[PDB]
Structure 1
Amino acid sequence: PSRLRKTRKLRGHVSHGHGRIGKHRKHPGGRGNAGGMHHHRINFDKYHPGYFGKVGMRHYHLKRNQSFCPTVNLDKLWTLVSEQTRVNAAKNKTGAAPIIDVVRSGYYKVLGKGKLPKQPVIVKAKFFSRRAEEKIKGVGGACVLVA
């Protein structure tokens, strides 16, 4: 809504809010990102460190499908299964240890962040980390690798 904008309040003012000493010219400093090395160097060096220069190796034909590996933490692992499955745990006096498949929910890598409740689980994943496996073994479960 142009009604609520600033241009309506500037009617009658000569400079239109751009000063009368230094007028509003086309491009006093240049167009775009001009002058990153000269006359605009301080802004680039104090707000965008590492802008200039080249680092690392090139990868000509990079495909994101190969590097696709979603991760899930042990902090939220029972959320992938229904709540009644977790309710049917520490119960039945058998040690059921229901199987949790993370590839079904859309995860390949299992990370060890978070606290795992004291209940045996069967976790099947493409990859495992050392801490996650340690937590699962300490709780009383087992890690299963799936291709």
Structure 2
Amino acid sequence: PSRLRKTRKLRGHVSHGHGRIGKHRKHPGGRGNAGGLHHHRINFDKYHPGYFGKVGMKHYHLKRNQSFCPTVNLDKLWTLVSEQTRVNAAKNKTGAAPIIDVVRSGYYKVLGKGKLPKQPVIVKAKFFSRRAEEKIKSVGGACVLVA
């Protein structure tokens, strides 16, 4: 809605909100990111440090699919199965532990943030972190690897 804008209020004021002295000119200071090392250097150094220069090794033909490896944390681990699964495992008389396939749920690596409920569980994952494995073993579970 153009009726809600400053232009409808700036009618009758000669400079249209841009001042009488400095005016509104075409491009004072340059176009785009002009002078980022010369006369906009303070702004660039203050708000975008690291902007200039090269760091690291370049790699031609990067394929994101090769490095595709989504992660899941242990605190969200039990959300990958049904509530029926967890309650049945908790109230199970036998020590049978449910299997959670994070690769089926769409995760390749299991990370160790959080804590697990005190009940055994088998976890199928491509990769495990050390603390995730430790915390799974703590509740009497097992970590099994898949390809």
Superposition TM-score, scaled by structure 2 size: 0.98
Q: 1-side partners of 2:13 and 2:90: how far apart?
A: 77
Runs of 4+ in 1 over 2 A off after TM superposition: none
Structure 2 portions without partners, runs of 5+: none
* Structure 2 counterpart SS, 1:88: helix
* Structure 2 counterpart SS, 1:136: helix
Q: 2-side partners of 1:22 and 1:107: how far apart?
A: 58
Q: 1-side partners of 2:125 and 2:43: how far apart?
A: 47
Q: 2-side partners of 1:23 and 1:90: how far apart?
A: 74
Superposition TM-score, scaled by structure 1 size: 0.98
* Structure 2 counterpart SS, 1:77: helix
Over aligned residues, Cα RMSD in angstroms? Answer: 0.6
1:92 shift after superposition: 2.7
1:20-62 CA distance string (max 9 Å, x none): 0111000011000000111110000000000001010010010
1:39-89 CA distance string (max 9 Å, x none): 110000000000001010010010000000000000111100000000102
1:91 shift after superposition: 2.0
Percent identical across equivalent pairs?
98
* Structure 1 counterpart SS, 2:96: coil
- Structure with more helix by fraction: 2
* Structure 2 counterpart SS, 1:59: coil
Structure 1 portions without partners, runs of 5+: none
Q: 2-side partners of 1:18 and 1:90: how far apart?
A: 70
* Structure 2 counterpart SS, 1:124: strand
1:95 shift after superposition: 1.0
